[PDB]
Structure 1
Amino acid sequence: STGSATTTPIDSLDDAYITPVQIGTPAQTLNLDFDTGSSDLWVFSSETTASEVDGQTIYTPSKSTTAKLLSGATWSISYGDGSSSSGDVYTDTVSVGGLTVTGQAVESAKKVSSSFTEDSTIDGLLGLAFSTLNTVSPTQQKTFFDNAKASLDSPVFTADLGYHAPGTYNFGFIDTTAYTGSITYTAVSTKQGFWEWTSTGYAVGSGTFKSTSIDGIADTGTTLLYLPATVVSAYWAQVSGAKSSSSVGGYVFPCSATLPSFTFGVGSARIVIPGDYIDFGPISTGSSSCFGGIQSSAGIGINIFGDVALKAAFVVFNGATTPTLGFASK
């Protein structure tokens, strides 16, 4: 089997991407944030505290003839950005782009933090990191990909995120028309439950490539590119007027600037992030100070190849016995 679903930016800045997911019988379609940095599929639901729902589409398991309460199961998760959610668990039929999993754990939110409430466009998350990170207790549950794997034509899914435009998540096949040149595959460590890999270095604009190992995670659920302070300093030094602002919470730059590109290494290959991808617009409405899309990972504890990086590539998440990551230009 295979699946193919379009993923759409939630706003003009590509702050995140939503992908329609069918849950239950009859289908209830929710727009979920596919997140290769976490491993819970959770949804706004009929059980979510009413004051914490503000425009989201909810899953109502009582209206699904295939929903079954997973007795005794609860979940609770906190994300790198400080947001959190928690609740109980159903199993139900979940389909993504024509690909169907029966008995998928659908984690029903009883509580969500304010940032989820305040984002009316995201109805929940669909985790695509390794199932070892799944928070369901007392019986850990498998991700949608993990459940689908054995049925897939090939045990892979691919992320093809658009810049200010829709893109695609595919399951079970590699669309050879979706990228240019070749896919370069690189080793993954699953030791922390992430799609963790080692970039071979970087360049800023038309500058020389610096060969240096950068361990980080391919994370579709993180907006920006978080890299070591040395790297990030080298980037923003090439933008006149750019500075790190503790009050704003990162590097800012004059909105009048033209941003240089940023290149990262995948083995001997090179992915080029155009400078426009690195502009996340005014820090506040009407401001001429703009927020940068490359930020320091210092104090995160891990480097994150978030959407800013991933959207410049066709990315293969190879879930073979020994997982690997593939990157192609597009």
Structure 2
Amino acid sequence: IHEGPYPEPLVNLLDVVYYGPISIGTPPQDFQVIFDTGSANLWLPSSKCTTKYCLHHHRYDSSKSSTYEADGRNFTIVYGSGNVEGFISKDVCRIGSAKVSGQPLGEALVVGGESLLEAPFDGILGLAYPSIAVDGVVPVFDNMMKQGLLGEQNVFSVYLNRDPSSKEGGEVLFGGIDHDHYKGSITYVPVTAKGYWQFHVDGVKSVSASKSAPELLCKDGCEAIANTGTSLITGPPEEVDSLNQYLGGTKTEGGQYLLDCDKLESLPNVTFTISGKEFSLRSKDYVLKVNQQGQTLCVSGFMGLEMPQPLWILGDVFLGPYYTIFDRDQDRVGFAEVA
């Protein structure tokens, strides 16, 4: 869930964000969090919070934890329609069998309205670089590195299962790259700005069967991020307007576009070129069929989002067909075809 204010989108995809278990404190209190490469903060609902969001979620209670350490600096984070405010504490953070001691976390005293209200997760565990963390927070993965919990392979790898008939939603592997989730070879791209997992893209294109010219975007190259906490692909409004027009999409009304559910059958691939290799998304990958106000809507996986500097956010739509390696040893991002 990207930080910053922005328009309310038509469809709320919080239901389809990918999340997983962690525990905090001694003895462990359990939570579910988004593992979010688009942010660097860790936060959970506080037991001191009495907002509607907090009361419907699991809440961290410092007074039951023997490893809790006070801090109390205040923080704020904005997430479009919602914001999170509270204070920092420290405690043991358990991710699978790893034990991160002295991990800072935001105890959220207030959480944002209705946008975040339907979250099936309790909070967010950010996996980006420390430059985008709120003051007083060292990101979890940085602490894993500092404490030597990764056996000197300071990467993590992300596999997303989109098959809504499966049990598995995928995994995050800390300190490993699992070749049993990919085929072929990995294409690495260097990180261009250490904040987000941000890198250069060479071009974006689509070739329709029923159009006489291709759609060529990002023709001089562009910047992108790999963001596990965003469902859709977002890009500069004018480029995405153009792409969705090419595809036969109709805008309304949060930078999202709707496609005619009866005309999906010949939609073309949309191809991102990265480190000179083509990453081609199939319409079966990028069209989201959503039920909303008792309607059946075919939502384009590409939405417009105005950034301070223009940027493509390669969210779960992009990441699904790929196994992705986030490598802090070499400040690079790796992509391979998912197995």
TM-score of the superposed pair, with normalisation by structure 2: 0.83
| Displacement of 1:285 | 2.7
Does the 8 Å CA contact 1:255/1:282 hold for their aligned counterparts? Answer: no
How far, CA to CA, are the matches of 2:116 and 2:187 in structure 1? 39
Structure 1 residues without counterparts, runs of 5 or longer: 1-10
Which moves more between the two structures, 44-53 or 202-211?
Answer: 202-211
Give the alignment's Cα RMSD to 1 decimal: 2.5
| Same amino acid, percent of matched pairs | 30
Counterpart of 1:263 in 2: which secondary structure?
strand
| Displacement of 1:263 | 2.1
Does the 8 Å CA contact 2:46/2:60 hold for their aligned counterparts? Answer: yes
1:147 aligned onto 2:143: yes
Q: Which amino acid aligns with 2:97?
A: G
Partner of 2:235: 227
1:78 aligned onto 2:100: no
How far, CA to CA, are the matches of 1:294 and 1:228 in structure 2? 10
How far, CA to CA, are the matches of 1:273 and 1:315 in structure 2? 15
Structure 2 residues without counterparts, runs of 5 or longer: 1-11
Q: Which amino acid aligns with 2:301?
A: G
Counterpart of 1:53 in 2: which secondary structure?
helix
Partner of 1:5: none
Specify which of 205, 211, 226 is matched with residue 218 of structure 1. 226
User: Quick one: structure 1 residues 230 and 110, their matched pair in 2 at CA, closer, same or farther if it must change by over 3 Å?
Assistant: closer
Which moves more between the two structures, 60-69 or 283-292?
Answer: 283-292
| Displacement of 1:229 | 4.3
Aligned residues: 311
Counterpart of 1:163 in 2: which secondary structure?
coil
Does the 8 Å CA contact 1:92/1:103 hold for their aligned counterparts? Answer: yes
Partner of 1:183: 186
Does the 8 Å CA contact 2:235/2:302 hold for their aligned counterparts? Answer: yes
Specify which of 161, 174, 177 is matched with residue 174 of structure 1. 177
Partner of 1:315: 324
Offset from partner CA, 1:157-196 (integer Å, 9 cap, x none): 11112214511101111111111111111011235x1111
How far, CA to CA, are the matches of 2:14 and 2:114 in structure 1? 17
Counterpart of 2:180 in 1: which secondary structure?
coil
1:276 aligned onto 2:279: no
Partner of 2:161: 162
Which moves more between the two structures, 111-120 or 95-104?
Answer: 111-120
Q: Which amino acid aligns with 2:323?
A: F
Which moves more between the two structures, 140-149 or 203-212?
Answer: 203-212
Does the 8 Å CA contact 1:53/1:117 hold for their aligned counterparts? Answer: no
Q: Which amino acid aligns with 1:99?
A: A
| Displacement of 1:224 | 0.8
Partner of 2:206: 204
Counterpart of 1:328 in 2: which secondary structure?
strand
Partner of 1:44: 45
Counterpart of 1:62 in 2: which secondary structure?
helix
